[PDB]
Amino acid sequence: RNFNNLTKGLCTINSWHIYGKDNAVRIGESSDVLVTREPYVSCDPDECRFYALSQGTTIRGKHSNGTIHDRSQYRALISWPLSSPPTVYNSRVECIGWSSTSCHDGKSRMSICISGPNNNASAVVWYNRRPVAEINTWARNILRTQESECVCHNGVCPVVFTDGSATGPADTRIYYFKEGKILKWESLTGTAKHIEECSCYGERTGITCTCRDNWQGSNRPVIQIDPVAMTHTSQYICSPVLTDNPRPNDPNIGKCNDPYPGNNNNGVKGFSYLDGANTWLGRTISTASRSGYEMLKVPNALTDDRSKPIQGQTIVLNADWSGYSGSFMDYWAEGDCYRACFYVELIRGRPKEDKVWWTSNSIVSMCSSTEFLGQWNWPDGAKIEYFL
Amino acid sequence: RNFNNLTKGLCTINSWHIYGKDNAVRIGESSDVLVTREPYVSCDPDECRFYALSQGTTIRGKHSNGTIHDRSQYRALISWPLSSPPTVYNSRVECIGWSSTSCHDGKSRMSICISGPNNNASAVVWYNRRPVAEINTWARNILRTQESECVCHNGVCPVVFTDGSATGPADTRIYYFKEGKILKWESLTGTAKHIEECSCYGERTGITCTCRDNWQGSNRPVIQIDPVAMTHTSQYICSPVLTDNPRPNDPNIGKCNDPYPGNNNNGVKGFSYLDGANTWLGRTISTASRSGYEMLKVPNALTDDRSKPIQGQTIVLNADWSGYSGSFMDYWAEGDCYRACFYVELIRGRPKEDKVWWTSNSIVSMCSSTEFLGQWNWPDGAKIEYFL
């Protein structure tokens, strides 16, 4: 093998089509399916798998009571074949911790898991299924990372980490890893003011990440990373189309070097594909809660403060619950461009459905196409009454 | 590897023997077995697997209530090892959609799944487990395909698609694919008037497909495809032996260029092997409902309008429920000819057994032999009362 090099551009996105769907909650009503949260999709040279953080229990078990919590000793990063449910019997554990990220570099997979108490957390970096290196907490307030696929170029895999208050300034850093070891690190620069949970994709131009601003903005920070130079810059998406959740109603004019105000101390992980005219933004439909999901084609959204959608597609109806979303790609696929893909977490149970004591999710995943294809909502649909 | 070339003829069929049987409904009474419909069997160079469309739920789960429906977001094409049940834990998802087809070309497997709403459906063509190409709906009325194995020659895999009314004329097309991409397409020609769900097999002479005529005929359309020229013709099987379901009673003289009248707007997927004297037709035993199943040796059935059976074999007794059937072959098997094989779906539950709210199926599969072997009915046999 050889390391994956980002040499191709993105394929024109005219519409999105179904790539995968596990139906985990629906199947789990009467089978040995694990309770998970914060899913992502990531591909190796010959296989795509679903990744998620497990709660160490099945949906119908009694230890599912209280799975609403985010951090515990029982959490681990697992992976399973794409479109199969996260079962007890077909899942593989990659590493242990309550926050994680992973990516294949063209030779072997790297993964990072974060574990420990809120004021003494640490990250363990694994490569080729063995521990390689560790990073201890520096701000002593929830060390956390991307919860998505990382992108490598010629063996170098930048990873974004944050440690600090989620309701104020925090120490955001980028570490550049190669074969699990750290080559370089940088403090966050540019004009973004608060960064969490970055969704990254690569192209021949570098690595682009869309992140959450949980402190002030309804717009999203963007980190632009050059993996060869191992340098970066940052800004917000200029477009007036707001993408976080909760958010205020869309303005006529957006902001580029400052968060758009209206809803403080909250937000949801999400993504965008920024490519001039070929620019798509994902977001929820509700502005008050994490429900629905749609894709909007908003030309030059990164730089045009007055841009509005010219095309779009509904992924999830606002009648149905949504969740965290993010980007991924098959960097080993045949063709002269990369096919952009994304996933959406569909959250069921707590905190919205109080008839049950568990929280869990299903995964829906879609990829771009150059055809203008018909659309269909892809809801979860498990009937909650069957679990009562 | 190299692409599979259709170079051999068919082996003489004197009788049929058991090849496989999963006992899915019987095992599923008290195990984690998925609800499926519309099964088929298809082989790779070193393995045969069962394929079916899953409803995203187990037989004893509560989401099995309402599985009678044909099209939903939960449907996916899965495959599992031959003669094992379609379990939650041993199945692999090939693609997502409510209608599908697949085949190995000698180097890698192609699969096609159709998803979307009734008036905005689309097909996604996968190859080597990655999306390659898409086809959008053209008649805006249930884009649908074969529900069986496709046959490739030197990398070219013709696929039959229909879009249009199931109770009237429809736009039927053949697309010729290579490595997931489209090389050519044709509108349906010849004298067949309505085509759905074609069961295809190959031989050194080309690809032969037996299809359903859901509009008017009790006889079946035949499509004869030349994969090198990428051209085709069509007609009906001339034999007076009728093979659809429901059907009128068998006439003394059949029809070749026109559907045989008597039962409109209905029918079942089925197959035939057409080889002059070595010609076998499959059909249900009941003329009123999908029960029983038999094979009849009817010499020159394709061209002789007065031909009658000279030999036959019972596969399923008419006391037991049957279902869709179709053909398949191992094109990589050792020998100087191809061994013809077929499968029958055994449908249990709704719409005939109203004591349960689910519909599901078991698979029985048989292959030809040159010996005159003894026969035995191969029923499903799950006791429905055990599910009440």
Partner: antibody, heavy 122, light 108 residues
């Protein structure tokens, strides 16, 4: 090579219809969608209509919408334009053009080949 | 709906630029922008497609680009035989195609 040959031109008193067509050769007709473009004498090019490779999708310029119909007969390699209720504003040289893209439902051009055009006077 | 300079000019050997300005639903909407060259009495020839691709048979003196909602055609090494009416066109969100007003290019 690719050729597109326009015919059916002539003079139409206002309110009357006229039917144009193009004979296509040198390529597989069935693999490409096609467009009609018109040019009034002394003016620039105006797009009129597009039809998909299988005839399933038909789109029109607003200026002719509701008056013109586009169709194709794949068995004769022939593209047609049915113009009803012609007005003085429709005087133009009408051209056929071949869409460059292969068996796609993306009706975006470029116009790979142009015919020579035929004049319709109203 | 796409605005072009009415005319541009330059002497032989000079480069000239022909712009084409549309909106975000047109030129800046999709990268399906193309340029055509028409000589009086003849059907138009395709020169550039998908913003910057040259069809075989088109010389390398013709190139182009796009920024924002503005498309641009560059003619390098202007020759006397290049005198023609140049048009831009693009696919729009309406599922229609449009042509611009056209630019007359003359040679001095």
């Amino acid at each position: 090579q690719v050729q597109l040959v326009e015919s059916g031109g002539g003079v139409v008193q206002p309110g009357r219809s006229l039917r144009l067509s193009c004979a296509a050769s040198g390529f597989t007709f069935n693999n490409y969608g096609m467009h009609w473009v018109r040019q009034a004498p002394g003016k620039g090019l105006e797009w009129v209509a597009v039809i998909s490779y299988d005839g399933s999708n038909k789109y029109y310029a607003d200026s002719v919408k509701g008056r013109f119909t586009i169709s194709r007969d794949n068995s004769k390699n022939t593209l047609y334009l049915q113009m009803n209720s012609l007005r003085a504003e429709d005087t133009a040289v009408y051209y056929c053009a071949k869409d460059k893209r292969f068996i796609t439902m993306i009706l975006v051009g470029p116009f790979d080949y142009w015919g020579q055009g035929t004049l319709v006077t109203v | 709906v796409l605005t072009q300079p009415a005319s541009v000019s330059g002497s032989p050997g000079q480069s000239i630029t022909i712009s084409c300005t549309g909106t975000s639903s047109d030129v800046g909407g999709y990268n399906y922008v193309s340029w055509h060259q028409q000589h009086p009495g003849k059907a138009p020839k395709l020169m550039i497609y998908d913003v910057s691709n040259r069809p075989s048979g088109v010389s390398n003196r013709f190139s182009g680009s796009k920024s924002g909602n503005t498309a641009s055609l560059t003619i390098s090494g202007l020759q006397t035989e290049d005198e023609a009416d140049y048009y831009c066109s693009s696919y729009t969100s309406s599922t229609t195609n449009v042509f611009g007003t056209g630019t007359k290019v003359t040679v001095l």
